[PDB]
Design a protein around this nucleic acid. Structure first.
Ligand SMILES: [Zn+2]
Lengths: 225, 330, 411, 124, 116
RNA sequence: GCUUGUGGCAGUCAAGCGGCGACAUUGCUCAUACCGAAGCAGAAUUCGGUAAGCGUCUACUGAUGAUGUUACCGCAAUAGUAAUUGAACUUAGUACGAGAGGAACAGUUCAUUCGGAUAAUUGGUUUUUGCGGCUGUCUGAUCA
């Protein structure tokens, strides 16, 4: 089930895409074959929508969401918001944040039931994230890393953390998520696991450089089968 | 310096004559190949770039777009040309018998002092069934191979103190030259509009004389490959509106243009900056050939055009919007 | 050092080398001169040409030494492999001669340049200039013999397989081309001549394969009956970290007597005991029992033309080397099927629709065609006032002016 | 193109958590020719750390500019400038050293370097 | 599109006009013209400048809140659109302008009280 | 009908020239582009040729001055001429290749320099000698 692809000959799959259990988002740009990578492995399972965030190709890093909705930065344009709402199922809420941080994909990590946020985020937005996503939120830093969404990848089946997350760090975090966690690397030693790949309960895509042991580790920990 | 333009001497005249026209098309319907206009300042536009494979594909982009005042053009006559070993030669020319006062002024310098004895014997040549006029036209059909129309701008319709119509030739295209001269026959004393010669997204080139600097400036230039975005019917309303804005606006900015008056006739929005300052006459030609590129073929989904006063920093696009701004009045 | 040497520059023949350098200076230096020219200018004019000519020879000699590795400093394995294919004394002599020629060229420059810079006539500078370049031609001209040998080695050394002694390898050995040659191609993607004549292979081969997510490379011997060709395998067996596999036949291939193979095995027994050898075979048991005396060897009766037995031996060899809330899944996910590479009815992708539109780059990616609406009905259609429910609220806005249009002070 | 505001030899602060205090730029990677080509937002420039990690004395490493502080024209229409200029430390392949980046980060630079955007939380 | 109002003057900044400033706390600040940008550096207080809507509404020169004005409401909860909604909302814009213009029919003479 | 690329001394032999003697002979002393060959598998590369492209009082120019009189529109004999380098998508991780690595054609998108224009906007730039403010000087003084 795990797929090995690239965007514009780039191994950072999570930078230019954002996927969930109910919908898929892909960045537009000079290249277009990246769209077919998900379509070939998804088809009609979940919709795939071409869209930009603030005119950038880093949608994956600038946005965070779950199967029940999407969370977009303060700089999102109404044209993108209106187009996104009209190209997604009814059960997908969209709203902008009002906070100093903008790179939601790097500053925030969420799954279908639990979420992790920057400890310095304001208290007001914590309620909004829970309400919009319908998920629990915990202020946490993976092994002291401040950008949880960039160095951590989470899902219902399991999660992945950057290699510096020792076993002690993995175990303590597993209590909050109550799921198995593995510390390693993707795309042949890329410490940014979150940006290097995107995974859900039934599909995982990684960069071309992803070695066989790395691909198998992702498959085993995330319980693809 | 660039030896392609040297020596950097004076231009021939304020008006620039088109040295070359589109080659030929002996199958397409007869139509004009050029037009005339004036430099109506400049403005700014915002549009979504539908160019594939671009760094800003589907993103909004800002670009300065020049507006040229192109009032309707009326044909005063036609010119026939015949190939010769020494080059093309003008065989014969005819006139419409009712040349406007603006055209009649073009042939006089001290117009007020002159008796104003313009075309009179030629005008009397129309006192019969056209035997004299038709015979001169017949030889052009029998002998001429390429036909150029004599037309002038409706200067009286422009906010210019000149009132002296600019007169220049425009080359025709089409097969069966008999039809080409017949086309001119119908248009004698009639007017033509830019919409019948140009269209949106078409690629054109403009030729004019650059701004002077009191040995600098005052030279003819032919900056090629300028894209037409909008060809607006200035006489009609909502010329400055857009499909996705649907608010009635006029392209003329508040307070008009610098050193230019209001626009009340047909106009063309052109990419880039056509050479020549304000009040300078510009002649339009279409690409000199069938250019084929993605940039040329790409259409423009115009979103919004800036129409704010340039005499300082603008705030509103129309006085009606200024209501959301008074002791001196009440 | 890396396991590849294809980057060595080509060693041009002495006849071609002489022309290249001499012609290079002529085209890259001035030629017009007259006896009336200044003495200082003439000497400088000739000095640059002489200096440039010497540099050209030095550059080629300098580059040759850089590209060619030192035979005794690469690796104990590659040391002998190069020595067996390229005689050490001849190899060192060629490199040593090149260095000597370069040193003589430097002597040529120092001797004549000093003499030339103190000249006082055009002929003296001109004649001395020819003398300076005359010895360079003579030195190179007599160097033709070693140069030819270097080029032959250069065109062959770079072609040698990039075998890595350090990483894991699987040596293949046995009676000449008794099933062994075809074995390498079976393990992984590789090509070896299968025509079964005695010495079907004259040089080493490598075939890469992965097990346990770890890289392995199988190595095939040229053949063992001494012969110089066979000497290549002897050093490969000794200086390569591997568990060598011995090949034999019992019933089908070559019909050769196992007695000779067993006796030949004992000849190599002392040398390659430290490799945990294994024996593969395509009173017979008693003959093999003599080889079984070594605890670290096993006999595997097998067929060399099917994968089942190939993996049986390989699997043991690989071990020997190393012995040293609930998730949400929409029903549509499992209702569909995995992508079919060639099914005409497969779910077509934008990667294919683009070709239908004239190409990839020319296709204008349309954000439409994947739209969700109650009904489209248009498909093509201060803007904050588009939110619904505003029209209903207008009922609480009409009567605002009724209380301000009939009272003074803004009337 | 955008207006240049970082001439060769300039010094500014560091916008990453690598611990560097200030950065000194001596050249621009892929330097053009004509007046030297001043650096700009998103460009990679060879820079040396003035103060911070003591081991970096006279050490030149590639750096990516994330702020310019000089007003420039953007294709988005608006003209804007940053409060201060700063860069980040990364290898030629874009492997950011600092695990996190703070402060304004140019939108063009973030899109140009996928990993830098992943390491930036205050982009735009 | 959907231009933002200048914080220092409340004047909308059309595309290609005005300047913007990005701080470490960016909270993007937009200046409609060079005067506001230069004035902002000089620490001129909006509550004191007599020519900015911030002072005019704060000082009582004009009204502060109105029923139509409360619906500025830069909403961020889009719903699936339809042409009927778009067409109807256009009528609301005309009514919004009409009532707002009707509201723009009085306080610039209400302040004349005491100067009858 | 000067110039460049191949040494001094000594010795054998000789195609020939009529006893002399060519060459062989022994001793020491380009980064760009297009073609042809190269164990050139790919990438990169050398060699040879082509373009010599491409790089580490008077010269000039402003101005004036019988071809019936003037004005408009034209042709062109002639002189000059310009564009240049690099980068991203896709074709690609396919062809090739045990492996490591890894192209090309076509179709698209950008950036540097050079040059002709533009001042829509950004700026060095103020005799808006336009507003508001200030210092001395006012007239006895609100008025300057
Ligand atoms: Zn303002």
């Amino acid at each position: 089930m795990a797929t090995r692809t690239q965007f514009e000959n780039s191994n950072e799959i999570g930078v230019f895409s954002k996927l969930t259990n109910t919908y898929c988002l892909v960045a537009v740009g000079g290249s277009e074959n990246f769209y077919s990578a998900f379509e070939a492995e998804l088809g009609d399972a979940i919709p795939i929508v071409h869209t930009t965030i603030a005119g950038t190709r880093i949608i994956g890093r600038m946005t965070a969401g779950n199967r029940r909705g999407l969370l977009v930065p303060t700089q999102t344009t109404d044209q993108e918001l209106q187009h996104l709402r009209n190209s997604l199922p009814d059960s997908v809420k969209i709203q902008r944040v009002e906070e100093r941080l903008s790179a939601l994909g790097n500053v925030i990590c969420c799954n279908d039931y639990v979420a992790l946020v920057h400890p310095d985020i304001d208290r007001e937005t914590e309620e909004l994230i829970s309400d919009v996503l319908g998920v629990e939120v915990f202020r946490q830093t993976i092994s002291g890393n401040i950008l949880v969404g960039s160095y951590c990848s989470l899902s219902n089946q399991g999660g992945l953390v950057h290699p510096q997350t020792s076993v002690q760090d993995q175990e303590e975090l597993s209590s909050l998520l109550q799921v198995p966690l593995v510390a390693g690397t993707v795309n042949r030693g890329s410490s940014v696991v979150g940006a290097g790949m995107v995974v859900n309960d039934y599909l995982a895509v990684t960069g071309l450089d992803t070695t066989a042991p790395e691909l198998s580790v992702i498959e085993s920990i995330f319980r693809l089968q | 310096g660039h030896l392609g333009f040297l020596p950097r001497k004076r231009a021939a005249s304020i008006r620039a004559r088109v040295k070359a026209f589109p080659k030929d098309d002996r199958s397409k319907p007869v139509a004009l190949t050029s037009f005339l206009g004036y430099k109506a300042g400049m403005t700014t536009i915002v549009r979504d770039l539908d160019r594939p494979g671009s760094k800003f594909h589907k993103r909004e982009v800002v670009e300065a777009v020049t507006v040229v005042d192109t009032p309707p053009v009326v044909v005063v006559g036609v010119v026939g040309y015949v190939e010769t070993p020494r080059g093309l030669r003008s065989l014969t020319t005819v006139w419409a018998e009712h040349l406007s006062d603006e055209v009649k002024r073009r042939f006089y310098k001290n117009w007020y002092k002159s008796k104003k004895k313009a075309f009179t014997k030629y005008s009397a040549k129309y006192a019969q069934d056209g035997a004299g006029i038709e015979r001169e036209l017949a030889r052009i059909k029998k002998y001429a191979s390429v036909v150029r129309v004599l037309v002038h701008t409706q200067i009286r319709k422009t906010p210019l103190a000149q009132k002296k119509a600019h007169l220049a030739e425009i080359q025709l295209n089409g097969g069966s030259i008999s039809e080409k001269v017949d086309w001119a026959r119908e248009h004698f004393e009639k007017t033509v509009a830019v919409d019948s010669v140009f269209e949106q997204n078409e690629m054109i080139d403009a030729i004019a004389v650059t701004k002077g600097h009191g040995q600098r400036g005052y030279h003819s230039r032919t900056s090629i490959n300028h894209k037409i975005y909008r060809v607006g019917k200035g006489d009609d309303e909502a010329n400055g509106a857009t499909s996705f804005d649907r608010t009635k606006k006029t392209i003329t900015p508040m307070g008009g243009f610098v050193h230019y008056g209001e626009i009340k006739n047909d106009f063309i929005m052109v990419k880039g900056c056509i050479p020549g300052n304000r009040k300078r006459i510009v002649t339009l030609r279409k690409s000199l050939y069938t250019n084929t590129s993605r940039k040329a073929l790409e259409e423009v989904s115009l979103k919004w055009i800036d129409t704010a006063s340039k005499f300082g920093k603008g705030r509103f696009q129309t006085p009606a919007e200024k209501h959301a701004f008074l002791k001196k009045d009440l | 050092m890396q396991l590849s040497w294809k980057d060595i520059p080509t060693v041009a023949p002495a006849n071609d080398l002489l022309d290249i350098v001499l012609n290079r200076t002529q085209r890259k230096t001035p030629t017009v001169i007259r006896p009336g020219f200044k003495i200082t200018r003439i000497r400088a004019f000739y000095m640059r040409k002489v200096k440039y000519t010497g540099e050209g020879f030095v550059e080629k000699f300098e580059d040759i030494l850089k590209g060619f590795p030192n035979i005794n400093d690469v690796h104990p394995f590659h040391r002998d492999l190069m020595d067996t294919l390229y005689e050490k004394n001849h190899y060192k002599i060629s490199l040593a001669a090149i260095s000597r020629a370069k040193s003589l060229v430097e002597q040529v420059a120092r001797d004549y340049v000093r003499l030339l810079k103190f000249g006082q006539s055009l002929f003296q500078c001109k004649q001395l200039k020819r003398a300076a370049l005359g010895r360079m031609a003579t030195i190179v001209k007599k160097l033709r013999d070693p140069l030819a040998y270097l080029e032959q080695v250069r065109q062959h050394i770079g072609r040698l397989p990039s075998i890595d002694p350090n990483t894991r390898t699987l040596l293949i050995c046995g009676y000449p081309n008794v099933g062994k040659s075809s074995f390498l191609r079976c393990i992984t993607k590789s090509d070896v001549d299968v025509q079964p004549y005695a010495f079907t292979t004259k040089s080493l081969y490598v075939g890469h394969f992965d097990y346990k997510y770890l890289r392995f490379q199988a190595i095939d011997t040229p053949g063992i009956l001494m012969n110089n060709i066979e000497m290549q395998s002897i050093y490969a067996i000794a200086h390569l970290r591997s568990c060598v596999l011995y090949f034999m036949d019992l019933s089908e291939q070559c019909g050769f007597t196992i007695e000779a193979q067993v006796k030949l095995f004992h000849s190599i027994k002392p040398l390659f005991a430290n490799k945990s050898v294994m024996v593969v075979i395509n009173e017979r048991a008693q003959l093999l029992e003599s080889v079984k005396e070594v605890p670290g060897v096993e006999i595997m009766t097998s067929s060399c033309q099917l994968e089942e037995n190939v993996m049986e031996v390989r699997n043991k060899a690989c071990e020997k080397l190393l012995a040293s809330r609930t998730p949400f899944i929409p029903e549509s996910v499992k209702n569909l099927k995995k992508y079919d590479p060639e099914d005409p009815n497969r779910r077509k992708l934008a990667r294919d629709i683009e070709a239908e539109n004239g190409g990839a780059g020319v296709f204008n990616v349309n954000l439409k065609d994947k739209y969700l609406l109650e009904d489209d009905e248009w498909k093509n259609d201060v803007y904050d006032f588009l939110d619904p429910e505003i029209a209903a609220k207008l009922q609480a806005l009409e009567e605002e002016e009724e209380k301000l249009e009939n009272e003074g002070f803004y009337n | 193109r955008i207006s240049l505001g970082l001439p060769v030899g300039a010094i500014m602060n560091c916008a990453d958590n690598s611990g560097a205090r200030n950065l000194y730029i001596i050249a621009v990677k892929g330097s053009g020719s004509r007046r030297l080509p001043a650096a700009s937002l998103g460009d990679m420039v060879m820079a040396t750390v003035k103060k911070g990690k003591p081991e970096l004395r006279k050490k030149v490493m590639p750096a990516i500019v994330v702020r310019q502080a000089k007003s420039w024209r953007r294709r988005d229409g608006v003209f804007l400038y940053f409060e201060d200029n700063a860069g980040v430390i990364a290898n030629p392949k874009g492997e950011m050293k600092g695990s996190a980046i703070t402060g304004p980060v140019g939108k063009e630079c973030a899109d140009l370097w996928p990993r830098v955007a992943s390491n930036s939380g205050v982009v735009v | 599109m959907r231009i933002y109002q200048c914080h220092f003057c409340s004047s909308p900044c059309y595309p290609g006009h005005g300047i913007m400033f990005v701080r470490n706390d960016a909270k993007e600040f937009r200046f409609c013209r060079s005067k506001c940008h230069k004035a902002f550096k000089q620490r001129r207080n909006p509550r004191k400048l007599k020519w900015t809507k911030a002072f005019r509404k704060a000082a009582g020169k004009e009204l502060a809140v109105d029923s139509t004005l409360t619906f500025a409401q830069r909403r961020n909860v889009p719903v699936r659109y339809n042409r009927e909604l778009v067409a109807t909302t256009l009528k609301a814009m005309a009514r919004i302008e009409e009532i707002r213009q009707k509201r723009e029919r009085a306080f610039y003479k209400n302040r004349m009280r005491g100067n009858k």
